[PDB]
DNA sequence: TCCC
DNA sequence: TACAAGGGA
C-alpha cells in the first residue's frame, strides 16, 4: 500500500489537498483505497505508485484547463478562475500556475519552488501574520506547488460553492464536505455528484442567496445524488466571502453538521414531488422569514419552528398540501 | 388517529373559499400552556361551526363535516392525563399544522 | 514523586494556532499556556527573586526554572472529561498592529472560542521541597484567566496526589510518542512559549455525533503502566 | 483591592452585541453552543451569549466617565474623552493628553503616571514593547445551565421589524412604494437569566508592572510610582464604574432597547491580597463551589471578605447581606 | 440634567406598534417573550409589548412640538417639522433648515449648534460618516411580571373584524369586476399593567462627542457650541415633551384606538450627575430596589433628588410626593 | 362520571339542525362561566327549554330528547359545591360547553 | 505606483 | 441597507 502521507497546514487545506487526492487517484485507476482521517491530516491508504497518481492528476488539471480555455492574459468565468476567486490578480495567477505545474508534470520532472495560497481554499491563511508585536511584508503562508494545484483539483471537483451578484458586490458561499471516520471509492464518488460546475446564479427574484445556511438548503433541494450519510457520519465547514465596496472579507465561519438537514429533507419528500420541491421553492422565495424560521426548526428541533414556517408561508403564497402535513407530523414522532 | 378529521374542520377557517379569515383562534390554539386555554380556544373555534356550513351552502359546495361526537370525547379523556405540558405541546402543535393543510373542499 | 492536579471550571478558553483573521483555537490547551499560568502564579505569590525589572524577562526567567523542575519539557497534560465544542463570535478586534493605516481604522474581525465544562490539569515535579511546595500548592489556584483575556478561568479543586503506580487506560494526553508505540489525532501545540520547540502530540479525544456539533469525547487510549485515582475513578497517565 | 463578583442577573427585551447586523436588513444577535445534561445525554443548544469585549469597553466608558468629576482627571488620553481606546500602533509614540501635552512612551512609570486609562485598562507600544496587560477581567455572559435544562424548548429569540419613514417633499411616502414603507429591518430580541464574573484587580493600580517593589531599604513595601490620594482616587473610580455596569448600561441599541434589567442574585469576595476567581454564573452549582473555594482559601490563611445578595452562601461564613450592587461598592470604598 | 423615571401605566384597548403585514389582512400587534418564575422552574411566556423605537420617536414628535414655540425653534431641521425621523438618510450630504437655509454635514459642532433635533436625539450621517449618539433612552412597554403571573395566560389579545363601505355613485356594492374597495380586516386590541423606563441625559446637549472640553485656564470647561439660554430652552423643551408622554401619545392608531392611560405609580430621581439607572417596572419588587438604590447612593455622596408618585418608597428619606407627570417634570424643569 | 356526554347531548338540541331553535346565547353563557352560580343558572337556562324540544322533536317525526336524569343533576350539584376553585371551574365549564357542536345525528 |  | 475597513500581483 502506498499509504501516501499528507503534509499538516491547516484542516481546511489539509482537507482539499488529501481529498483531491482521490479525485487525482480514480482517472488514473487506483482501486481499493480508503481515507482515515486524523483530525487534520487526513491520511489515505491506497495501493497505487507514483507514476499512476501522477498521469490521473495530470488528466484531471488536462481537463481543468480545456474547461478554462473554453471562455475568455485569460479571465474564464470557472470555479478555480472566477467563480471563486475573489481577487482579481487571482484570476490570472491561479491558471498559470496550473499550466505551469501541468508543463512541469508531462516530462516526469518534479517541482522546485513555491506559491502564495489564496484565502479561498483556506479561509485560516491571509495576507500577514502576528510574528511578536506586528507583522510580515508580502504573504508568509506559501505551499509546495503540486499540493496547491491537487487541493484545487479536489475543491474544483467536489466542493459546492454558491455565488449571488446583488449588483457592484458579490456573496461567495463555499462548503466542505468532511469525513471523520471511515470513507472508500464509492461514497467519495457520490460526494463528487454533489458538486455542480457555473453555479453563476446572480438574478434579483432568487435573492435568498444570502444567508449562506439559506443558500445551501436551496442548494441541497434539488440535489438527489444519494442519501449516504444516513448512514455514515459527516460534517460541513462553511465560510462566505463578500465584495462590499470591493473590500474583501470573511464574515462568516460557523460550524454545524449536513447530515440531519437532508435526512429530515427526505423524509419529509416520500409522499411526493410535484407538491414537495414547489413547496420549498414557494416558501424560500416568498416566505424569506418563514424559510429562516423552518431552516433554524430543522437546525434546532423546536416544535413552533414548523407552525411558524408554515403559516408564513399559507400566509402569502403556499398551497401547504396535506401530504407534506403527514410527513411533518411524521417527522416529529 | 381522530387527527385528520378535526384538522379539515380547522382548515376550514384558513381556506380562501371561506373568506372569514379566523386566525386568532387558530394562533391561540397553537399557543397553549395546559388544559383550560387549550379547550377555550378548541371551543372558540368549534363555535364557528354555523357560518361556515351557511357560507358552504349558499356558495353551492358541500358544507363541512363537523367532527363527530364518537372522537370528541376522545380528546378529552386524552388530554387529562397530560399534566406535562411538554407532551401536550407536541399535539398541541400537531393540531395547528394540521389546521394550515391545503384540503381541498369546494371546488 | 509528586504530581499537582487542579481542575478548572471555565466558560471558555480562546488559546489559538498561528493564523490569520481566524484565530484557529487549540483543541486542548497547550503546555506553553499551562506552563505560563503557574508562572504568573509564583511570581505573584513571591516576587521578592522571581520578578526583576523587565516584565518579558521575569515570566521567561520563571519559566526556565519551572521547566527545570519539570521531569521534561513535554510534562504537563489535560484531561478532556467534559465535552469539547467550537463557537464562532464576530468581535471588534480592531487590527492596528499592521504597519501603517494610522489608528482610527476599524476592521470588524472573527474569532472562535471553545467550549467546554470543566478541565483537569497536571504538574509533574520531582521531590520538590516542602518550603517551596507549599508555594507551588497556593500557586496552583489563582489561574483566573487561560489565554485570551476573556477567557476566565476558575479552579476549584486543586492537590497532590501520588500516582501509586496503578494500571489503567491512557487518560491524560500526551505527546504523540507511546501511542505510536501502542480516531488517532495528531496536533501541534508548541511545547514552549516564543519569546525573541513543536513536537507531534497525541490527543485523546474521539467523535461521538449524538447531536448538531459532534464535539468530542474519551477515545479510551490502551491500557499505561501509570495512573491516578480521583473521586473513586483512574484514569491513566505517562511520565518520561 | 482584589475584588471578585459572580452572580446571576436577570434582563429580557434586548438586542445586545448584534452579530455583525446583515447585509438583507436582517441583524442578528450572536449565538453559542452550549453542552448541557438532557437524562443521559449531551445535547447541545443555541442561546444568545453577550462577549467579554463588550463588558471590557462599557467598563472602560463608566471608568472615564467617573474619572472626569475628580480633580485628577486631567491625567487621560485624548482617545477616552471620544470613547476610544485603541492605545496607539506604530505610527504612534506620542500621547496627547486632555489639554494637548506631549508624554514620552520609552518606560511605563511615566505612561501610567500622565494616563488613567492606560493604568487600569492596560495599553500597547509595539515600538518599544513595555506591554501592560488589562487589570480588569471580563467574561462571557452565558444564560445559567439550569434556566436551559428546564427550558430547553422554545427560541427565546423574537425578530422584529422596524421601518424608517422619509417622506416625499409635501405629502407623497416618496417613489419607491409601500412594498417596504421606505425600508424595513430587522432586529432580534433576547429573554433569558444570565451568569456573570468580573475580575478586578485594583491592588496593581499606580504600580509598575515590571517593578512591583523598588526594595532599597530592605523592606518589600509597593513601588507606587504615582501620587497616593490620586492613586486612591483612580481606585474609587474604578470601584464606582461598576455601579453603571449592573443597572442596564450594557450592550447596544441602548436608545431603541435599553434592555429591562435587574440583578437576581451575586457572590463577592474582596481581599488586599491575590486571590482566585470563584466561578462563572452559567453553572447551576456554583454556590456550593464558592462555598468550598471560600472554605479552603480560609483554611490556608486569606483574610477574604465575603458580601452575599439574595444568597445565603453557607451560615458559618461571616457573609454580610447585601440590597444592591452600590451598596456593595460602597462597602467595598471604605478600604 | 441627569433624569431617570420608572414606573407602570394601565392600559386596555390598545393596538399599539403591530407588525402590520403578514400578507393583506389581519393586522396582528407585536409581542414579546418574558421569563417568569410562576412558583416553579422559570418559564417563558408571549405577551404584547411596545417596543422603544416608538417611544423614542413619539419623545422627538413632543420635543419639536415643545420646541417651535421657543425663540429659537428657527435652528431646526426642515424634516423635523414634518414629524419625518430619517435624519441624513443615504445619499445626501446636506441637510434644510425650518428656515430654507442649508447645512453642510462635515463637522458635528455645526450640525449640533444649528440643528435641534439631530442634538439631543443623535444623528448618523453615512456618507460623511458622522455620529453623534441620542440623549434619550427607553425601554419596552411590557406588562407587569405579577400581573403576568396572576392571570394565567388568556393571550391577554382580542382580535375586532370591521369592514369599509366604499359604494359606487349608483348605490350599489359592485363585484371585484366593477371595482368595490367592500372589504374586511381585523386588528388586535391588547391590555394589562404595563411598565416603563425611559432615561435622559439632558447635561450633555449642545456639546459636541468629539471634544467635550477645551481647557483654555487649565480647567475642564464644558464645550458649550450654543449660547446658555438656547441650551436651556432645548433642555426645557425636552424635559416637556414628557407632558404629552403619559396622556395618550405613544401608540400609533390614535384616530380609532387612542390608547386609555392611567400612570398608577411612579418614581424618577435628578441628580445633575452620572446616575446609575433605575430598576424597570416590569419586576414586581421593583418598589423596594429602587428605594435601596436612592437610599444607598444618597449615603454614597451623591446629591440625588427623588420624586414619587403612588409609591410609599421608605418614609425615611427626603421625597417628594408629586401627584401628576407634568407637576413631576414642572419640579425637574423649576430646579434647572 | 358519563353524565357529561348525557348533558352535553342535551345542550346539542339547542344549536342542531332540523329545530329551528338556535339559542347560542345559553350555551355562551355556560361557556364563559366565570364563577359556579352563573354556571348554575345558565344551565337552568338550558333546561328551562325542554318542554317545547321534546314536543317539537315528536312533531318533526324525530326521536325524543335524551332529558338528563335526576342522577345527572344531582352529580352537576355535587361537583358544585366540592368545585370552589375557578381554575377547575374553567375547565369544567368548557369541558360540558364543548360538546354542544358536534356532528350528533338527533333526527336520523 | 497597478488592480478592482 | 445605506459607509467605511482589502486582498493581492
Same mark, same amino acid.
Given at each position: ?161 454558491i455565488?449571488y451578484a446583488k449588483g457592484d458586490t458579490t456573496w461567495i458561499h ?32 432568487l435573492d435568498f442567496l444570502i444567508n449562506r445556511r439559506l443558500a445551501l438548503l436551496y ?19 462553511s465560510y462566505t466571502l463578500e465584495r462590499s465596496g470591493?473590500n474583501?472579507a470573511i464574515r462568516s465561519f460557523e460550524?454545524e ?27 424560500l422565495?416568498?416566505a424569506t422569514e418563514g424559510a429562516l424560521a423552518l431552516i433554524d426548526?430543522?437546525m ?34 | ?35 383550560? =386555554?387549550? #379547550? &377555550?380556544?378548541?371551543?372558540?373555534? +368549534?363555535?364557528?361551526?354555523?357560518? $361556515?356550513? /351557511?357560507? %358552504?351552502? *349558499? ?13 370528541? =370525547?376522545? #380528546? &378529552?379523556?386524552?388530554?387529562?392525563? +397530560?399534566?406535562?405540558?411538554?407532551? $401536550?405541546? /407536541?399535539? %398541541?402543535? *400537531? ?13 | ?87 464562532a463570535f464576530l468581535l471588534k ?15 470588524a474581525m472573527r ?130 | ?13 434586548h438586542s445586545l452585541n448584534a452579530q455583525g447586523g446583515g447585509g438583507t436588513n436582517y441583524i442578528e444577535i450572536t449565538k453559542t ?13 443555541e442561546?444568545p451569549?453577550?462577549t ?103 427560541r427565546?429569540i423574537t425578530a422584529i421589524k422596524h421601518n424608517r ?15 417596504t414603507?421606505?425600508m424595513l429591518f430587522s432586529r432580534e430580541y433576547a ?60 450592550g447596544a441599541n441602548?436608545?431603541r432597547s ?78
Open positions: 500500500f502506498n499509504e501516501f502521507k499528507t503534509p499538516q497546514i491547516d484542516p481546511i487545506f489539509d482537507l482539499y489537498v488529501a481529498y483531491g487526492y482521490v479525485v487525482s487517484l480514480i482517472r488514473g485507476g487506483a482501486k481499493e483505497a480508503t481515507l482515515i482521517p486524523h483530525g487534520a491530516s487526513y491520511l489515505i491508504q491506497t495501493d497505487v505508485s507514483n507514476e499512476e497518481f501522477r498521469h490521473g492528476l495530470v488528466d484531471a488539471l488536462s481537463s481543468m484547463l480545456s474547461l478554462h480555455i473554453a471562455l475568455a492574459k485569460l479571465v474564464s468565468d470557472a470555479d478555480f478562475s472566477a467563480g471563486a476567486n475573489i481577487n482579481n490578480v487571482y484570476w490570472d495567477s491561479v491558471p498559470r500556475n496550473l499550466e505551469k505545474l501541468m508543463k512541469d508534470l508531462e516530462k516526469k520532472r518534479s517541482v522546485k519552488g513555491t506559491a502564495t495560497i489564496p484565502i479561498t481554499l483556506m479561509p485560516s491563511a491571509g495576507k500577514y501574520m502576528l510574528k511578536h508585536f506586528g507583522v510580515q511584508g508580502g504573504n508568509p503562508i506559501k505551499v509546495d506547488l503540486l499540493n496547491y494545484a491537487l487541493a484545487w483539483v479536489g475543491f474544483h471537483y467536489y466542493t459546492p460553492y455565488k463555499i462548503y466542505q464536505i468532511a469525513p471523520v471516520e471511515e470513507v472508500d471509492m464509492i461514497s467519495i464518488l457520490s460526494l463528487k455528484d454533489l458538486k455542480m460546475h457555473l453555479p453563476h446564479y446572480y438574478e434579483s427574484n442548494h441541497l433541494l434539488h440535489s438527489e445524488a444519494l442519501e449516504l450519510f444516513t448512514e455514515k457520519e459527516f460534517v460541513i465547514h470591493n474583501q460550524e453538521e449536513i447530515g440531519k438537514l437532508m435526512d429530515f429533507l427526505w423524509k419529509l419528500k416520500r409522499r411526493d414531488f410535484y407538491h414537495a420541491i414547489k413547496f420549498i421553492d414557494d416558501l422565495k416568498k426548526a430543522i434546532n428541533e423546536r416544535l413552533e419552528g414548523f407552525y411558524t414556517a408554515l403559516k408564513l408561508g399559507k400566509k402569502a403564497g403556499v398551497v401547504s398540501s396535506r401530504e407534506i402535513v403527514a410527513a411533518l407530523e411524521d417527522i416529529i414522532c | 388517529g381522530w387527527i385528520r378529521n378535526i384538522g379539515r374542520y380547522l382548515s376550514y377557517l384558513v381556506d380562501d373559499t371561506f373568506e372569514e379569515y379566523a386566525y386568532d383562534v387558530v394562533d391561540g390554539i397553537a399557543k397553549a400552556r395546559t388544559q383550560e =386555554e387549550l #379547550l &377555550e380556544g378548541v371551543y372558540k373555534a +368549534l363555535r364557528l361551526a354555523p357560518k $361556515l356550513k /351557511k357560507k %358552504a351552502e *349558499s356558495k353551492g359546495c358541500p358544507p363541512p363535516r363537523i367532527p363527530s361526537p364518537e372522537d370528541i =370525547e376522545a #380528546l &378529552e379523556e386524552k388530554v387529562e392525563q +397530560l399534566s406535562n405540558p411538554k407532551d $401536550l405541546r /407536541k399535539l %398541541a402543535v *400537531s393540531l395547528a399544522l394540521w389546521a394550515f393543510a391545503s384540503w381541498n373542499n369546494c371546488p | 514523586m509528586d504530581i499537582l492536579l487542579v481542575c478548572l471550571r471555565f466558560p471558555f478558553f480562546s488559546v489559538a494556532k498561528r493564523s490569520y483573521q481566524v484565530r484557529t483555537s487549540f483543541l486542548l490547551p497547550p503546555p506553553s499556556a499551562l506552563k505560563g499560568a503557574l508562572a504568573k502564579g509564583l511570581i505573584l505569590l513571591k516576587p521578592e527573586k522571581y520578578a526583576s525589572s523587565s516584565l518579558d524577562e521575569a515570566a521567561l526567567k520563571a519559566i526556565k526554572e519551572i521547566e527545570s523542575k519539570l521531569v521534561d519539557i513535554k510534562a504537563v497534560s489535560v484531561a478532556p472529561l467534559s465535552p469539547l465544542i467550537r463557537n478586534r480592531l487590527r492596528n498592529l499592521e504597519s501603517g493605516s494610522n489608528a482610527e481604522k476599524s476592521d474569532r472562535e472560542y471553545t467550549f467546554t465544562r470543566e478541565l483537569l490539569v497536571a504538574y509533574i515535579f520531582k521531590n520538590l521541597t516542602q518550603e517551596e511546595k507549599n508555594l507551588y500548592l497556593k500557586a496552583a489556584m489563582l489561574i483566573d484567566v487561560i489565554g485570551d483575556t476573556e477567557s476566565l478561568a476558575t479552579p476549584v479543586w486543586a492537590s497532590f496526589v501520588k500516582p501509586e503506580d496503578k494500571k489503567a487506560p491512557l487518560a491524560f494526553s500526551a505527546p504523540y510518542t507511546e501511542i505510536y508505540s501502542l480516531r488517532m489525532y495528531i496536533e501541534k501545540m508548541r511545547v514552549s512559549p516564543e519569546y525573541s520547540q513543536e513536537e507531534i502530540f497525541y490527543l485523546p479525544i474521539e467523535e461521538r455525533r449524538y447531536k448538531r456539533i459532534v464535539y468530542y469525547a474519551r477515545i479510551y487510549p490502551p491500557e499505561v503502566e501509570k495512573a491516578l485515582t480521583v473521586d473513586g475513578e483512574v484514569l491513566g497517565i505517562w511520565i518520561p | 483591592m482584589y475584588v471578585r463578583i459572580s452572580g446571576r442577573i436577570r434582563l429580557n427585551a453552543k452550549v453542552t448541557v445534561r438532557t437524562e443521559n445525554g449531551w445535547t447541545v443548544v442561546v451569549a453577550i467579554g469585549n463588550m463588558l471590557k469597553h462599557w467598563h472602560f466608558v463608566g471608568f472615564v466617565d467617573y474619572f472626569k468629576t475628580t480633580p485628577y482627571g486631567v491625567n487621560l488620553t485624548e482617545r477616552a474623552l471620544r470613547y476610544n481606546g485603541t492605545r496607539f500602533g506604530q505610527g504612534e509614540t506620542t500621547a496627547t493628553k486632555a489639554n494637548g501635552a506631549t508624554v514620552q512612551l520609552n518606560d511605563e512609570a511615566t505612561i501610567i503616571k500622565e494616563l488613567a486609562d492606560a493604568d487600569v485598562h492596560g495599553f500597547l507600544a509595539p515600538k518599544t514593547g513595555r506591554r501592560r496587560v488589562s487589570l480588569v477581567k471580563a467574561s462571557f455572559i452565558l444564560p445559567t445551565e439550569d434556566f436551559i435544562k428546564e427550558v430547553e424548548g422554545e427565546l419613514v422619509d417622506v416625499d417633499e409635501k405629502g407623497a411616502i416618496g417613489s419607491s412604494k409601500e412594498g414603507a421606505q429573554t433569558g437569566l444570565y451568569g456573570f464574573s468580573i475580575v478586578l484587580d485594583l491592588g496593581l493600580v499606580g504600580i509598575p508592572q515590571g517593578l512591583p517593589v523598588k526594595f532599597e531599604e530592605n523592606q518589600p513595601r509597593p513601588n507606587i510610582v504615582i501620587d497616593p490620594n490620586e492613586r486612591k482616587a483612580r481606585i474609587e473610580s474604578a470601584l464606582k464604574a461598576l455601579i453603571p455596569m449592573l443597572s442596564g448600561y450594557i441602548l436608545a435599553f434592555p429591562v434589567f435587574k440583578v437576581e442574585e451575586l457572590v463577592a469576595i474582596a481581599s488586599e491580597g491575590p486571590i482566585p476567581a470563584l466561578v462563572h454564573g452559567f453553572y447551576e452549582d456554583y454556590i456550593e463551589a464558592n462555598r468550598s473555594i471560600i472554605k479552603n482559601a480560609r483554611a490556608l490563611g486569606f483574610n477574604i471578605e465575603v458580601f452575599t445578595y439574595n444568597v445565603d452562601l453557607g451560615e458559618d461564613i461571616e457573609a454580610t447581606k447585601v440590597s444592591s450592587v452600590e451598596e456593595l461598592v460602597a462597602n467595598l470604598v471604605k478600604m
